[PDB]
Amino acid sequence: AVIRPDFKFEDLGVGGLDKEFTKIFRRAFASRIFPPSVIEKLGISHVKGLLLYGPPGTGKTLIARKIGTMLNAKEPKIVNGPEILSKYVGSSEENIRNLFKDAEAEYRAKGEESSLHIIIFDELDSVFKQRGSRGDGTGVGDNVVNQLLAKMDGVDQLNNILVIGMTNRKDLIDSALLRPGRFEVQVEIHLPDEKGRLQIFDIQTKKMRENNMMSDDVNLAELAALTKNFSGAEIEGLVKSASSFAINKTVNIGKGATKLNTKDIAKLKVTREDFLNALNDVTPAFGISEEDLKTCVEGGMMLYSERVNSILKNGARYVRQVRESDKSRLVSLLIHGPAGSGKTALAAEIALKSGFPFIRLISPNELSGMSESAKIAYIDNTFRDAYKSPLNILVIDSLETLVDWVPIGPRFSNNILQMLKVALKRKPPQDRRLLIMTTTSAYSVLQQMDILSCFDNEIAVPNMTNLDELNNVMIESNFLDDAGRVKVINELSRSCPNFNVGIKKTLTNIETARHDEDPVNELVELMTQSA
Amino acid sequence: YSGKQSYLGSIDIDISFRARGKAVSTVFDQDELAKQFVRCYESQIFSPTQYLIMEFQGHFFDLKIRNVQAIDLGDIEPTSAVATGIETKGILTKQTQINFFKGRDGLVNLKSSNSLRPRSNAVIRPDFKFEDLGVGGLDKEFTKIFRRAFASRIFPPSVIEKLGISHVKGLLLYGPPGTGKTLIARKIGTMLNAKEPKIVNGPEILSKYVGSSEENIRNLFKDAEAEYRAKGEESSLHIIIFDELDSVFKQRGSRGDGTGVGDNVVNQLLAKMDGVDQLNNILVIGMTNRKDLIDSALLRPGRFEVQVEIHLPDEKGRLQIFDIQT
Amino acid sequence: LKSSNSLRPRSNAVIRPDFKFEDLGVGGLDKEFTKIFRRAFASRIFPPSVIEKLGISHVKGLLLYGPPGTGKTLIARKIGTMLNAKEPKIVNGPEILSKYVGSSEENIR
Amino acid sequence: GQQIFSQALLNANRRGEAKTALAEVQARHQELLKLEKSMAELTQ
Numbered sequence A: 001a002v003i004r005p006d007f008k009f010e011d012l013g014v015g016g017l018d019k020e021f022t023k024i025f026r027r028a029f030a031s032r033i034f035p036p037s038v039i040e041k042l043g044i045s046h047v048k049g050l051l052l053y054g055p056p057g058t059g060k061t062l063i064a065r066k067i068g069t070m071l072n073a074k075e076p077k078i079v080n081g082p083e084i085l086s087k088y089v090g091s092s093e094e095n096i097r098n099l100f101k102d103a104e105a106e107y108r109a110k111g112e113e114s115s116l117h118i119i120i121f122d123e124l125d126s127v128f129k130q131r132g133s134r135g136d137g138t139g140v141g142d143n144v145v146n147q148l149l150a151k152m153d154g155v156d157q158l159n160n161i162l163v164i165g166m167t168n169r170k171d172l173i174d175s176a177l178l179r180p181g182r183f184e185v186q187v188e189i190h191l192p193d194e195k196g197r198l199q200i201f202d203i204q205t206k207k208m209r210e211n212n213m214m215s216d217d218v219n220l221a222e223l224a225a226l227t228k229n230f231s232g233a234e235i236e237g238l239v240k241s242a243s244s245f246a247i248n249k250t251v252n253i254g255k256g257a258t259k260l261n262t263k264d265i266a267k268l269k270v271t272r273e274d275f276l277n278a279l280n281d282v283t284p285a286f287g288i289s290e291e292d293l294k295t296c297v298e299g300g301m302m303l304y305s306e307r308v309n310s311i312l313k314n315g316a317r318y319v320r321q322v323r324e325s326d327k328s329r330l331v332s333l334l335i336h337g338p339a340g341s342g343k344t345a346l347a348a349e350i351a352l353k354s355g356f357p358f359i360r361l362i363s364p365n366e367l368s369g370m371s372e373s374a375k376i377a378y379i380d381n382t383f384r385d386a387y388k389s390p391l392n393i394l395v396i397d398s399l400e401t402l403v404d405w406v407p408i409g410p411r412f413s414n415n416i417l418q419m420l421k422v423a424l425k426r427k428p429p430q431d432r433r434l435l436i437m438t439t440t441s442a443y444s445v446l447q448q449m450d451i452l453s454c455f456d457n458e459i460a461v462p463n464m465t466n467l468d469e470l471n472n473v474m475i476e477s478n479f480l481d482d483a484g485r486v487k488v489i490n491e492l493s494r495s496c497p498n499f500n501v502g503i504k505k506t507l508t509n510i511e512t513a514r515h516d517e518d519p520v521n522e523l524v525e526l527m528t529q530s531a
Numbered sequence B: 001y002s003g004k005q006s007y008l009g010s011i012d013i014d015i016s017f018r019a020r021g022k023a024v025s026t027v028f029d030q031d032e033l034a035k036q037f038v039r040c041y042e043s044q045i046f047s048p049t050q051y052l053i054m055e056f057q058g059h060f061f062d063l064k065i066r067n068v069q070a071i072d073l074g075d076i077e078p079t080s081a082v083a084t085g086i087e088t089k090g091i092l093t094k095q096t097q098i099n100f101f102k103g104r105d106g107l108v109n110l111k112s113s114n115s116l117r118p119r120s121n122a123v124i125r126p127d128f129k130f131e132d133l134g135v136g137g138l139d140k141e142f143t144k145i146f147r148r149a150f151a152s153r154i155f156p157p158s159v160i161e162k163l164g165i166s167h168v169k170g171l172l173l174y175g176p177p178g179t180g181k182t183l184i185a186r187k188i189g190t191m192l193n194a195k196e197p198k199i200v201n202g203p204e205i206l207s208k209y210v211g212s213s214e215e216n217i218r219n220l221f222k223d224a225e226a227e228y229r230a231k232g233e234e235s236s237l238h239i240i241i242f243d244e245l246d247s248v249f250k251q252r253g254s255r256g257d258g259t260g261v262g263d264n265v266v267n268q269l270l271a272k273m274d275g276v277d278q279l280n281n282i283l284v285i286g287m288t289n290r291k292d293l294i295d296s297a298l299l300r301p302g303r304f305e306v307q308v309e310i311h312l313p314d315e316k317g318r319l320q321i322f323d324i325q326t
Numbered sequence C: 001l002k003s004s005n006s007l008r009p010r011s012n013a014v015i016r017p018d019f020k021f022e023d024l025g026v027g028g029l030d031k032e033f034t035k036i037f038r039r040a041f042a043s044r045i046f047p048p049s050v051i052e053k054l055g056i057s058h059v060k061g062l063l064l065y066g067p068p069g070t071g072k073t074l075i076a077r078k079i080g081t082m083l084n085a086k087e088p089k090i091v092n093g094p095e096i097l098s099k100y101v102g103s104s105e106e107n108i109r
Numbered sequence D: 001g002q003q004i005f006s007q008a009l010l011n012a013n014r015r016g017e018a019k020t021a022l023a024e025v026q027a028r029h030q031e032l033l034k035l036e037k038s039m040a041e042l043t044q
């Protein structure tokens, strides 16, 4: 009839997209399951158009290829877009109104007993662009749309045709075809989720595992975890790239001659390090984030005193509060302290430890070189994107620099400041949560601008002053031997007991002293000079 | 003269038809050829490039020993390097591994006997040194390229079929002017024992009549599809090289000409590189100076996977180039 | 066949031996002419054997630039019509462009 | 401030003119081959 009696969808390759399949099945072929008599008794018409769209390389063409064989359908007619056009006058419109002849004949012959004929238009946006483009030339690029529209709208009661159109850019499609009675249902295919990623990995490595060609060491769960934003095509590329490494241990290309170990050919086996190297080779094209924050804390923590622990605990308390309550849909925090004490690292650490689904960081590095309007648009888009997921953390770094503050004017950009002021107070749409954490070093200047009323709480980050903390950082950095580490501190105790430096400068001085002369004469000299 | 290496371990023989008009589609057993070779010529001394005339079942063939490996009695493993120099000579034995390759004419239809030997209509042949390409510098890019692209076509078909993967079908080379990104394409096209390359200059596709620009970009793949339908997975590599790629295949969506040809060409190429029908025996090479204008959909894996940057040389590269030129 | 070695003169030279810079008719520029006639028209006079034993190819480009009214077109004309070669294929400035979609590139081809 | 290109369609009449008269010349050629064969027999 319309679906084969022997089919369960477990065999078909497409994996990771199950909800979309159910939606398509429910809204497309459901009406053609019962005997016809019910439908007219219920006064419901059949659907005629289906549209699929998504980013490049998500699996739509796979669905189109396998649907015909999977669901006992008449061999679908497949035509590439730009193959319609032709040279002689009137040829193209004929070519379009030459595909529907079989359906018309069968309809006229057998009334409602006619089977279902399905034709799918690959690269739909190729020919059916906007029909008001203009150009003052050959009009064959417009009568094509008119012919298709005439045969699809003024069908003369053809109710046994379903057209499927796959595209990558919906915006380019002529608006005239997006209306009831013509391509009604539109299904979006987006990037897979982690479980879909595992399904895809299983499908790709099925045959490899079956023939004992994969070493037992490999663990698919770890790989699924590592591939943060990989689509299906990139996963397949990763698989074969990893296989190339295993291939390239027996056959040495270039070096020497062709030396094929006929014995190791039977022992060919992939392993984990090959997969890690393949991860090294292939890169995603989506990215967004989850790397900038990691590199922002590259130097790591040191827990040189209790203040770090207390601050981290307070951050944990706030993340818990935003995670639990449903009435607190917005929390903002300020982190202020002397310059160079280290602020961005702490915020990044807390954000990483939180483990929320959505995390991002806004810093002047990204915005550099843009025009002011571009900066405004970028900030607005970033906020709007952040307003999407159920839980969200947003980090703002060096607010004063984002506003171009210089104390000679004083000159600064008012538009950006006003936008940030209004944005920091906007609660997200219903049933969403946000946690904003902003850092600064010019507390007084913020006080003068009178934007201190949009922050719920403030956290200070005093720099270190006791020589004990210096000793801790020294021992953690492994600057010198134990005797030297003791001697330097005893000397500095009497050289300059009072101490106010920071953290960054300490590591810089440590390295410079290591390079030239690890003895006192350099490290202690610089340390005393700075303070 | 030899001292210890007195026997022949592995011998490679190129087989050709003495007369082009005597080509026969008969299936030749390599085991029978080796048996005849041992039966007729025993305890003889042979050297690389030495020629012979063989009469097998009334058919006359020209045999050229392309390479020879000399081994001493008692060597369990053939750890000796295969030598292409005429200096090496050996004595034929009833156990020498005889590998037959097609002659330069490529008319003899050999059987694969039951030996799972490397012998195939090879793309890369044996003994291929990077020192004969003639390109100085770029000694890491060549590795990467050959590992990712040609590493899977010189392997027994059964194993690659078991692994259930497919050969890559893209390659892109980009960099500043004058770094040597067209020499590589020429040498790859000429030195790989494949069909003649199908060179296309940058804007050589466009044409006046409506619907003829798109056809010119789908008349390049017709022969590949023609061969892939008949001989399955035994077809020879087909290679086509696009020069100055970024001239036509710009990001579709702008307003360039006012007619709308570039978008159609881009769509046709998109639909033909991956499409709904499998080809799996084609390769296309690209070159450009600006890699930020190419349409995004082209750069997805499955189309132009491997992308390489060719940059200015270092001091050792400069020395190598100076040595090559003079 | 193969090129052995024995060779002194060439069969159809380009510049011939009866040439001197006082015959062109361009006055003033004198060092420029030496440079031009050494870099470009010096590898087409030696016997082909030696030039083939050096493994070098000839230069295939020349550019002249300067203020307005100095002698560029005069040099081009004299070089074009005082040698032993095929007739020049002169092209004016925007004489390539055409109206149809793919006729300009064909005109350049 | 703008410019425009131009494309061209062939004449419908032409149609498949490659074989509009190819079929006809092929048919006449077949007639001429028949003529030649009959003349060969007659000369014999």
Ligand SMILES: Nc1ncnc2c1ncn2[C@@H]1O[C@H](COP(=O)(O)OP(=O)(O)OP(=O)(O)O)[C@@H](O)[C@H]1O
Pocket (backbone or CB within 6 Å): A296, A297, A298, A299, A300, A301, A302, A303, A304, A308, A339, A340, A341, A342, A343, A344, A345, A346, A398, A441, A503, A504
């Ligand atoms: N608690 C800490 N323990 C260990 N290392 C730290 C700590 N805090 C900061 N650092 C390190 O100190 C360095 C400076 O930190 P960071 O770049 O955040 O400085 P900052 O004071 O925010 O900068 P700026 O002065 O430019 O506003 C980084 O390498 C960071 O990893």
Ligand SMILES: Nc1ncnc2c1ncn2[C@@H]1O[C@H](COP(=O)(O)OP(=O)(O)OP(=O)(O)O)[C@@H](O)[C@H]1O
Pocket (backbone or CB within 6 Å): B134, B135, B136, B137, B176, B177, B178, B179, B180, B181, B182, B183, B184, B289, B321, B324
């Ligand atoms: N290793 C090398 N790298 C670069 N050039 C080389 C090298 N060895 C020799 N050459 C010489 O330098 C020339 C390099 O130019 P080539 O033909 O590769 O164009 P290209 O650098 O890709 O230029 P474009 O981007 O302008 O097309 C070659 O023609 C060759 O004569």
Ligand SMILES: Nc1ncnc2c1ncn2[C@@H]1O[C@H](COP(=O)(O)OP(=O)(O)OP(=O)(O)O)[C@@H](O)[C@H]1O
Pocket (backbone or CB within 6 Å): C025, C026, C027, C028, C029, C067, C068, C069, C070, C071, C072, C073, C074, C075
């Ligand atoms: N060096 C020269 N010796 C003799 N006559 C000269 C010289 N330079 C210029 N002239 C005279 O100038 C006239 C115009 O010069 P020419 O054709 O070289 O113009 P041009 O430099 O190409 O100018 P433009 O920039 O306007 O194209 C020539 O016909 C010639 O009579």
Ligand SMILES: Nc1ncnc2c1ncn2[C@@H]1O[C@H](COP(=O)(O)OP(=O)(O)O)[C@@H](O)[C@H]1O
Pocket (backbone or CB within 6 Å): A013, A014, A015, A016, A017, A055, A056, A057, A058, A059, A060, A061, A062, A200, A231, A232, A233, A236, B274, B302
């Ligand atoms: N579930 C899946 N999702 C995405 N790609 C898949 C999936 N299963 C297999 N693939 C592989 O990814 C590719 C599908 O990409 P495709 O849909 O053809 O790209 P496009 O979206 O541009 O048409 C094929 O190589 C296919 O083998």
